[PDB]
């Protein structure tokens, strides 16, 4: 028992982190097979970032202007191409530590592990959620660009995120591993608006199930509601609308706990309308929305890699 | 910027996790050099655990009753000894993936990473704190015994914790890597009382500095206090007494932020006496006590491994 925000074990990813240097910008890249991937803004000075012309900036770069180091070993670059917002540097050497891997584009409300890196070296690992507005609330200092987010599936690493920028607001934006941004963002130091964010309703309901499983039950009330009644409260409170898809993904948890999804919705409604009284659920005084139903289940049944 | 509960990268530890089976108890062990370490209660049935005589139970065990598997490879046991509450099984093979390592005994309020494992396989990683009462609030299912806690120091892994038990209360207890329990606990399924717990005052003050660094300043008030005045409030609220040692460890953060420790104490006093108003600090509606001053600094300056 116990419930904690758990990251995937990062070992597999740690063996793919390299340093990429171009001019005097250094950041992190991901060495898979004979390709290194990194943010294309490695080719930008601090001044370029204000209004980059990436094709123009890239045309002035040859293979030998890219200094790619893997710990102490230094790889040799035999090809460079830009794919959307990522550089793909082709190197002479296939990474011997390449895990089985996919590149995945995730959906808002989905969660993943970030291996926060500086200079091609691991700093730490934490579990994040792609906000509905396609930002993440991470921990990212200067040099952390190129750090990746991933899910692990037995022995396969699904890369879903590469870090590219902090917005003037202090939140974080980046791309899938094909270089397409999550959200409306672009790789330029300009003021850029993240939309209204919202709470991930289905995730919050999963966490309430986790709570019941771990014995926090005080918030279970004796009322019920309908899907539409709930949603019209959800909207008032900046919560994502709960669909049938979401009810269905909560289905297994419903079966474990013997609490109908719509009765858990009635509990949450009375939390939303009434707050918590200075009381706590699984040690938190707020409603947590960074556990997916799958996360609650993996943690509660204890899946390994 | 951003502030998150960050674990160490676990790669180094993942390569030391083995499965240990004895009779039909299976748990996790730690294979370093030619020694496997695990909880001695691997030799107990569910019934033994009620009143184990470990020396008697161990005397009925030979080397070949210990089934130690490292992924698919199965090691051969050439020696077994009990050291306090851990078995040390001596194996024919030195672990090729043995990191540089120490065994460390930590102090209450210190933090570490847990690599939660089942059957010798990594499940996840999260950052924990040794409570003042020497328990931890972890996530530990059946089979998680032998999972370790560690700190990493560039390339050296300091093992500080091996998981042994859940108390009837749902919290967690275990040993250092020499087999001495943290706290008054013993490896027997009996009702066992953890003392009154308290908040780790120095950790909470570190987190308030982290907050100021990241721009949450609303809680900074215009009052001051003395060390003794503070402590006499701290005690009333079940907070650890702040010593000069603690003020001194907060010294660097004081210098970064230009806020005297005793003025941050005055802020916290007014949080303690007055609460938070439904307001949040670094996204939390409670005061967080699981970041040490060193953690805040590593995260804020971004140290790598």
UniProtKB/Swiss-Prot annotation, chains A, B:
Activity regulation field: Inhibited by pyridone-containing alpha-ketoamides compounds 13a and 13b. In turn, alpha-ketoamide 13b (tert-butyl (1-((S)-1-(((S)-4-(benzylamino)-3,4-dioxo-1-((S)-2-oxopyrrolidin-3-yl)butan-2-yl)amino)-3-cyclopropyl-1-oxopropan-2-yl)-2-oxo-1,2-dihydropyridin-3-yl)carbamate) inhibits SARS-CoV-2 replication in human lung cells. Inhibited ex vivo by michael acceptor inhibitor N3. Inhibited ex vivo by compound 11a and 11b.
Subcellular localization: Host cytoplasm; Host Golgi apparatus; Host nucleus
Residue ranges of domain Peptidase C30 in the record: 1-305
Impact upon substituting residue 90 to R: In strain: Beta/B.1.351
Catalytic activity: TSAVLQ-|-SGFRK-NH2 and SGVTFQ-|-GKFKK the two peptides corresponding to the two self-cleavage sites of the SARS 3C-like proteinase are the two most reactive peptide substrates. The enzyme exhibits a strong preference for substrates containing Gln at P1 position and Leu at P2 position
Resulting phenotype, residue 49 to A: Does not affect ability to cleave and inactivate human TRMT1
Result when mutating residue 145 to A: Complete loss of 3C-like proteinase nsp5 cleavage
Domain of life: Viruses
Positions of crosslink type Glycyl lysine isopeptide (Lys-Gly) (interchain with G-Cter in ubiquitin): 5, 90
Residue intervals annotated with topology Cytoplasmic: 1-305
Residues of the signal peptide: none
Function: Cleaves the C-terminus of replicase polyprotein at 11 sites. Recognizes substrates containing the core sequence [ILMVF]-Q-|-[SGACN]. Cleaves and inactivates human TRMT1, preventing tRNA guanine(26)-dimethylation of tRNAs. May cleave human NLRP1 in lung epithelial cells, thereby activating the NLRP1 inflammasome pathway. May cleave human GSDMD, triggering alternative GSDME-mediated epithelial cell death upon activation of the NLRP1 inflammasome, which may enhance the release interleukins 1B, 6, 16 and 18. Also able to bind an ADP-ribose-1''-phosphate (ADRP).
Record text on subunit structure and interactions: 3CL-PRO exists as monomer and homodimer. Only the homodimer shows catalytic activity. Interacts with host FBXO22; this interaction promotes the proteasomal degradation of nsp5.
Name of the molecule in the record: 3C-like proteinase nsp5
Organism: Severe acute respiratory syndrome coronavirus 2
Classification lineage: Viruses, Riboviria, Orthornavirae, Pisuviricota, Pisoniviricetes
Residues of the full protein shown: 3264 to 3568 of 7096
């Amino acid at each position: 028992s116990g419930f904690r925000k758990m990251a995937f074990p990062s070992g597999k990813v740690e063996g793919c982190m390299v340093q990429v240097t171009c001019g005097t910008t250094t950041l992190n890249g991901l060495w898979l097979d004979d390709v290194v991937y990194c943010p294309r803004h490695v080719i930008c000075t601090s001044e370029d970032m204000l209004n980059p012309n990436y094709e123009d900036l890239l045309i002035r770069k040859s293979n030998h202007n890219f200094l790619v180091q893997a710990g102490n070993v230094q790889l040799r670059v035999i090809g460079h191409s830009m794919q959307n917002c990522v550089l793909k540097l082709k190197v002479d050497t296939a990474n011997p530590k390449t895990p089985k891997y996919k590149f995945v584009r995730i959906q808002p409300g989905q969660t993943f592990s970030v291996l926060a890196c500086y200079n091609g070296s691991p700093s730490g690992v934490y579990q994040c959620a792609m906000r509905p507005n396609f930002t993440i609330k991470g921990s990212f200092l200067n040099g952390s660009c190129g750090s990746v987010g991933f899910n692990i599936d037995y022995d396969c690493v699904s890369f879903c995120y590469m870090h590219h920028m902090e917005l003037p607001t202090g939140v974080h934006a980046g791309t899938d591993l094909e270089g397409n941004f999550y959200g409306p963002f672009v790789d330029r130091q300009t003021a850029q608006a993240a939309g209204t964010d919202t709470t991930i309703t289905v995730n919050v309901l999963a966490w309430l199930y986790a709570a019941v499983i771990n014995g926090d039950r005080w918030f279970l009330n004796r009322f019920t509601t309908t899907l539409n009644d709930f949603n019209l409260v959800a909207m008032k409170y900046n919560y994502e609308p709960l669909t049938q898809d979401h009810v269905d993904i909560l289905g297994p948890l419903s079966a474990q706990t013997g609490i109908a999804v719509l009765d858990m919705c009635a509990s949450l409604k009375e939390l939303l309308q009434n707050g918590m009284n200075g009381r706590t659920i699984l040690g938190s005084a707020l409603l947590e929305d960074e556990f997916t139903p799958f996360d609650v289940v993996r943690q509660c049944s204890g899946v390994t890699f």
